[PDB]
Paper text:
Previously reported BeF-bound crystal and cryo-EM structures of detergent-solubilized ATP11C both represent the outward-open E2P state, in which the extracellular gate is wide open, and PtdSer bound, but not occluded, deep in a longitudinal cleft in the TM region. Unexpectedly, however, the molecular conformation of the BeF-bound ATP11C-Nanodisc formed with DOPS (3.9 Å) is rather close to the outward-facing and PtdSer-occluded E2-Pi transition state. In the BeF-bound ATP11C-Nanodisc, the exoplasmic gate is closed, and the head group of PtdSer is occluded and thus isolated from the outer leaflet of the membrane. We therefore speculate that such a high effective DOPS concentration in the Nanodisc drives the transport cycle one step ahead, from the outward-open E2P to outward-occluded E2-Pi, even in the presence of BeF as discussed later. Membrane slices show a significant difference in membrane thickness in the BeF-bound E2-Pi form. The membrane around the end of TM1 is restricted in its thickness due to the strongly kinked structure of the cytoplasmic portion of TM1, giving a thickness of approximately 35 Å. In contrast, the membrane around TM2 of the E2-Pi state becomes significantly thicker than that around TM1 and other parts of the membrane. The thicker membrane structure observed in the E2-Pi form is likely due to the relative orientation of TM2. In contrast to the membrane thinning observed in scramblases, the protruded membrane structure around the phospholipid exit of ATP11C flippase suggests that the phospholipid poised to be flipped to the inner leaflet is momentarily located at this position along with TM2 and then released smoothly to the inner leaflet of the bilayer.
Numbering used by the authors:
A (entry chain B): 27 to 350
B (entry chain A): 19 to 29, 38 to 416, 651 to 726, 743 to 1091
The structure:
């Protein structure tokens, strides 16, 4: 009378695996056999990557930015020398690094209106409640409202190679390409109405701290407003109190010589960013990128630790079962 | 002690046969049920968070949080309402029965609830007595009435009863003609047959009556008039005041051991949640004590924030951490447990083995709340005359042997007399030939002096043994009454405690002449013995309803006696040999499924929240969620709930046929093994260890410049997704190792839930739709997936987090 379906009688076909000790013994060895070669493979690549760090914050009387550390109404400048014993051959990337800059703060992160930054004409006039107290200045709304856009990092870091003579040679820098492809072309869009970026922003005003309007970022019309590479990169959150963002990109030189030859280098710092108030620090990073990315020894070490342990425990488990 | 008048004319605080057994009133069911339900700490916590969440801060949509809480309350409301609705129908069935009485020497028809004390009731042949009555007049010779006391003691044989000697000759000729009888009676007492009364029947002429009413004169309520013509009864006791009623004790609902462990675990994580929230708030203001940590130049507080009291800000800040980590206690677990018991109960009904071809009826599940209760049974109480015998059942002897081999102490509590009861216990293999008996019966009990005499000498000789299969205890109705009731005289050595010491180390206990309330008392006293051992009561009579309802789980056999026991009992089976298949096979599987179900949900959400807690240290302690708002909501809805849901429905830890083959396997999970402090503490530390690896594994990964060949930095939403991707893959794959019975649905649900996460993240992340005010998760998942370094880290974190689990499984094979 009861329905004799295997499901109703709990007789459904089953794989029902039975993994004994001997079934899993080769698994410990094979995992160790895979991790150690791939672990040493990524670790040796990390050491081959050449990366240098130069701090230009100051905080020391010997530091030449001490005068920039003092408050100057006029723009300040630094000239920091550094020398490289190792040359850079591959693609060279420039990062600016901020430490103790709590970009992860909940109040700070939510302080942005992506609908306004998407080029929606409606949301441009009236930003939402998220960007406060930077919603409007003197009863005029800010087009890139919010603390994230307001506090955009504005420092000019230029590099001068010096040769045998005292004459320095500037290294070419690429502004484009640093931002995500999707964020530039899709996420961040200019308002549709009009052609000249002047006409688009009538009611809106520049951010309080900004000395330049949102429509006067770069001379080129494809970086002038809401689409500037530096502006988009700064918009992305840090994910850590200490972070670094892609400032510039130095492509490999067309000549056969390495991209950045090992030599004496001099750095411009325009220092328009008062980072010392909250115990912040500013660093500039020069790195060479491989398939995995930047210099990260943790990934190489971590495979070695698990790989050696798995193989060692594989031997230990092999011995104890060998006794039986 | 009151006076009862036959004529009611001598020369509803007290229920006048209006009986109701419903726990809740139909008019005020909702306020009573909700007030009791919210009293529970588990349900109160869900409500208070919802009210706080909407009031102060919403990490996710409040609609998602409160709806299952509204769901789980409604399902319980239906279950409590349905159980209450059955009670009213059963009360209506008894109340709406036609009964004939004599009023002013006129026969009239009315219901049971109208009958009152002292009324004269004409009871015809083959109709149950509306209430316990004095037998006054019978047309039969000598007033000899035979009744089958089927409901009173579970036995169906004729019992002789005699009418009052003055009125035995009274035939059906206006016997009660303005009768002046003034019966003086004792208080209603639950001694069943035992009764004392002082009848005073006086006619118009002066008369003196010194007759003393006895058990034979009084006919108890619930008996069936068998082979006796019409009789006339006077309701000396009416309504609730009977020996058939007031032995029910009402219904105290059923509580299961697993539900006790859920509440015990829920209060632990409620204290951890308080600790987690408190430490964050305390550390937050210590961190913000520095002038520049709070409101630096980049982000500044609004004017509304500045103009707030520090104490008020602290209170909302503490609740902000509370609502952030409220995922520690999983609401989805209560919803899943509700569904697991609903769908899981149908497997018993569909089972073909629980079908008796002789009577062509199958087992059913009246109460689905105690599916897991069957796996913890260690004390069994049977009926005997109905359940154990019929003589013996087809496999009655083999079933008893199976329970004994499974570590279940089985008892044969019966209302049957001593002489015939001892015969069966030897036959059913319960009492072996060599077993001598400690017959604490009326033959071996004389007054109060021998009471302690028998107990103390057993304490001397019987206790000293602990062979085991040599001592068996027998108790009678009178002896058990004295042991329990009259034990309060000795404080130093209570007779209840010494009796429990006796029963705890016997092979079996056989009781005789047990009234239905005594069955509840003996079962209840076993319940309060060095904790709460799980008791199973099985019976198939109207008298067994007391012990069936008293125990944790009740099994009601549907036999020749009737279906009175079946409808109140949680479960019903047609044969006693089906009790083996029930608790051994289904009971073990039902517990193991839900025990691992409970432990998984708490483990799942701890791994969910622990990285969120650690992220507060690296954040500004500003209650910044590590994951997206959408990801937090759907973690418990569609990502990880389905894998563990299908697991609970159909998973055989051991092969179902193998379970019945070896009854020793039931002893493994006897003492709530899966939910003990041992396994629970391992589950928490495993969750805590996996939580740390998820966060700090990613934290050290994010110490580099970039993780892509293009050298593009990654945001905090990439940090959240990397942790979340490892989280979903680890937790789901953790269930895969635990699962040892892979079916097509189990394969589909497990691997399908993993594939759905990848698909949905691509769907949610990659298409911009103009109805979100925030577009944080635009292309993060694809960018995260498009890096070789991220792939290597994810595979590493999955294996590291599963390393303690895989080590334990391999280690469990050896020693
Ligand atoms: C690709 C393969 C398939 C992949 C999955 C696809 C999606 C599957 C859908 C659901 C998953 C499974 C189901 C998962 C269920 C649990 C999910 C859950 O509880 O998630 C919850 C939300 O659920 C819903 O809102 C859905 C409706 C729930 C009620 C109706 C649904 C249940 C009703 C069923 C019918 C009635 C059954 C009982 C009848 C009794 C009669 C007496 C959320 O849990 P949370 O723990 O996250 O709670 C919020 C949290 N506290 C916060 O801080 O915000
Ligand atoms: C580069 O970014 C700088 C912010 O990091 C910002 O410098 C700001 O320049 C304005 C000039 O008026 C000033 O802003 C604040 O100063 C007045 C007077 O102290 C305050 O009352 C107001 O809060 C006002 O906003 C500051 O001099 C400076 N901001 C601060 C507080 O540091 C400029 O946008 C850039 N500087 C360059 C390129 O010159
Ligand atoms: C940058 O460095 C150059 C080196 O020639 C020098 O003009 C000065 O130190 C800096 N100039 C400016 C305006 O930054």
């Amino acid at each position: 009378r009861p329905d004799n379906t295997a499901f109703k009688q709990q007789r459904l076909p089953a794989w029902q695996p039975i993994l004994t000790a001997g079934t899993v013994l080769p698994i410990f060895f094979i995992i160790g056999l895979i991790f150690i070669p791939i672990g040493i493979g990524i670790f040796v690549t990390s050491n081959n990557i050449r990366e240098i760090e130069i701090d230009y914050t100051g905080t020391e009387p010997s530091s030449p930015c001490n005068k920039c550390l003092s408050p100057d109404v006029t723009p300040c400048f630094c000239t920091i020398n550094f020398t490289l014993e190792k040359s850079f051959e591959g693609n060279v990337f420039m990062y600016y690094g901020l430490s103790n800059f709590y970009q992860n703060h909940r109040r700070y992160v939510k302080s942005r209106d992506d609908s306004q930054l998407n080029g929606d004409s409606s949301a441009l006039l009236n930003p939402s409640k998220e960007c406060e107290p930077y919603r409007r200045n003197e009863d005029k709304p800010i087009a890139p409202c919010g603390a994230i856009a307001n506090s955009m990092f504005n420092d000019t870091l230029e590099l001068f190679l010096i040769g045998n003579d005292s004459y320095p040679i500037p290294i070419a820098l690429k502004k484009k390409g640093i931002a995500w492809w999707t964020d530039k072309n899709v996420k961040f869009r200019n308002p549709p109405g009009g052609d000249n970026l002047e006409e688009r922003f009538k009611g809106t005003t520049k951010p309080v701290n900004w000395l330049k309007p949102v429509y006067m970022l770069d001379s080129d019309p494809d970086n002038n407003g809401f689409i500037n590479e530096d502006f988009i990169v700064w918009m992305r959150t840090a994910a850590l109190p200490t972070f670094r963002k892609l400032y510039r990109l130095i492509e490999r030189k067309s000549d056969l010589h390495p991209t950045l030859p090992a030599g004496r280098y001099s750095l411009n710092v325009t220092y328009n960013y008062p980072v010392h108030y909250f115990d912040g620090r500013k660093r500039m990073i020069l790195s060479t990128i491989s398939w995995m990315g930047g210099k990260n020894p943790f990934l190489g070490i971590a495979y070695i630790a698990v790989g050696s342990i798995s193989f060692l425990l594989g031997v230990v488990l092999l011995v104890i079962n060998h006794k039986y | 002690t009151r006076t009862v008048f036959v004529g009611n004319h001598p020369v509803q605080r007290f229920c006048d046969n209006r009986i109701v057994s419903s726990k809740y009133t139909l008019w005020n069911f909702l306020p009573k049920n909700l007030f009791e339900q919210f009293r529970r700490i588990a349900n109160f916590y869900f409500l208070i968070i919802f009210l706080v969440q909407v009031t102060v801060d919403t990490p996710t949509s409040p609609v998602t949080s409160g709806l299952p809480l509204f769901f789980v309350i409604t399902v319980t409301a239906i279950k409590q309402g349905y159980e209450d609705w059955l009670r009213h129908r059963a009360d209506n069935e008894v109340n709406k029965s036609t009964v004939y009485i004599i009023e002013n020497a006129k026969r009239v028809r009315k219901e049971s609830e109208k009958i009152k004390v002292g009324d004269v009731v004409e009871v015809q042949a083959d109709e149950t007595f509306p209430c316990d009555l004095i037998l006054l007049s019978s047309c039969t010779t000598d007033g000899t009435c035979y009744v089958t006391t089927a409901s009173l003691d579970g036995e169906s044989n004729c019992k002789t009863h005699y009418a009052v000697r003055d009125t035995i000759a009274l035939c059906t000729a206006e016997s009660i003609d303005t009768l002046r009888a003034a019966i003086e009676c004792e208080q209603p007492q639950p001694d069943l047959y035992k009764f004392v009364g002082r009848i005073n029947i006086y006619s118009n002429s002066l008369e003196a009556v010194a007759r003393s009413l006895g058990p034979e004169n009084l006919l108890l309520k619930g008996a069936t008039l068998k082979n006796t013509e019409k009789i006339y009864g006077v309701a000396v006791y009416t309504g609730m005041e009977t020996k058939m009623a007031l032995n029910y004790q009402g219904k105290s609902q059923k509580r299961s051991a697993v539900e006790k462990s859920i509440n015990a675990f829920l209060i632990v994580y409620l204290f951890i949640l308080l600790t987690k929230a408190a430490v964050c708030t305390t550390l937050k203001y210590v961190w913000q004590s520095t002038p520049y940590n709070d409101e630096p130049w980049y982000n500044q507080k609004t004017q509304k924030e500045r103009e707030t009291l520090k104490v008020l800000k602290m209170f909302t800040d503490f609740l902000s951490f509370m609502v952030l980590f409220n995922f520690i206690i999983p609401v989805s677990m209560y919803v899943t447990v509700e569904m697991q018991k609903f769908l899981g109960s149908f497997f018993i009904s569909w089972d073909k083995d629980f079908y008796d071809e002789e009577i062509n009826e199958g087992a059913l599940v009246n109460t689905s709340d105690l599916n897991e209760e069957l796996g913890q049974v260690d004390y069994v109480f049977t009926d005997k005359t109905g359940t154990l015998t019929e003589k013996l059942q087809d496999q009655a002897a083999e079933t008893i042997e199976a329970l004994h081999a499974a570590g279940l102490k089985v008892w044969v509590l019966t209302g049957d007399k001593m002489e015939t009861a001892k015969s069966t216990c030897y036959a059913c293999r319960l009492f072996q030939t060599n077993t001598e008996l400690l017959e604490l019966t009326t033959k071996t009990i004389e007054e109060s002096e021998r009471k302690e005499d028998r107990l103390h000498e057993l304490l001397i000789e019987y206790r000293k043994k602990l062979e085991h299969q040599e001592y068996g205890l027998i108790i009678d109705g009178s002896t058990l009454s004295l042991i329990l009731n009259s034990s309060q005289d000795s404080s130093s050595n209570n007779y209840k405690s010494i009796f429990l010491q006796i029963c705890m180390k016997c092979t079996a206990v056989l009781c005789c002449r047990m009234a239905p309330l005594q069955k509840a008392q003996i079962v209840r006293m076993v319940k309060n013995l060095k904790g709460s051992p799980i008791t199973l009561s099985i019976g198939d009579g109207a008298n067994d309803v007391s012990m069936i309802l008293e125990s944790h789980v009740g099994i009601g056999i549907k036999g020749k006696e009737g279906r009175q026991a079946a409808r109140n009992s949680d479960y019903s089976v047609p044969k006693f040999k089906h009790l083996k298949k029930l608790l051994l096979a289904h009971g073990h599987l039902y517990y193991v499924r839900i025990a691992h179900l409970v432990q998984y949900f708490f483990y799942k959400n701890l791994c969910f929240i622990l990285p969120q807690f650690l992220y507060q240290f690296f954040c500004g302690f500003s209650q910044q969620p590590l994951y997206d708002a959408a990801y937090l909501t759907m973690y418990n809805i569609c990502f990880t709930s389905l894998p563990i849901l299908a697991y609970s429905l159909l998973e055989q830890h051991i092969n179902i046929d193998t379970l019945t083959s070896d009854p020793r396997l039931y002893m493994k999970i006897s003492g709530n093994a899966m939910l003990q402090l041992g396994p629970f503490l391992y589950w928490t530390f495993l969750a805590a260890f996996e939580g740390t690896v998820f966060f700090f594994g990613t934290y050290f990964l994010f110490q580099t410049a970039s993780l892509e060949e293009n050298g593009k930095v990654y945001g905090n939403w990439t940090f959240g997704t990397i942790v979340f991707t490892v989280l979903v893959f680890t937790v789901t794959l953790k269930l895969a190792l635990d699962t040892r019975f892979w079916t097509w649905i189990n394969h589909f649900v497990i691997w399908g839930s993993l594939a759905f996460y990848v698909f949905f993240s691509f769907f949610w992340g990659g298409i911009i739709w103009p109805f979100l005010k925030q577009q944080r998760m635009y292309f993060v998942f694809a960018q995260m997936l498009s890096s070789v370094s991220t792939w290597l880290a994810i595979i590493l974190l999955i294996f590291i987090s599963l390393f303690p689990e895989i080590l334990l499984i391999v280690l469990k094979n050896v020693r």
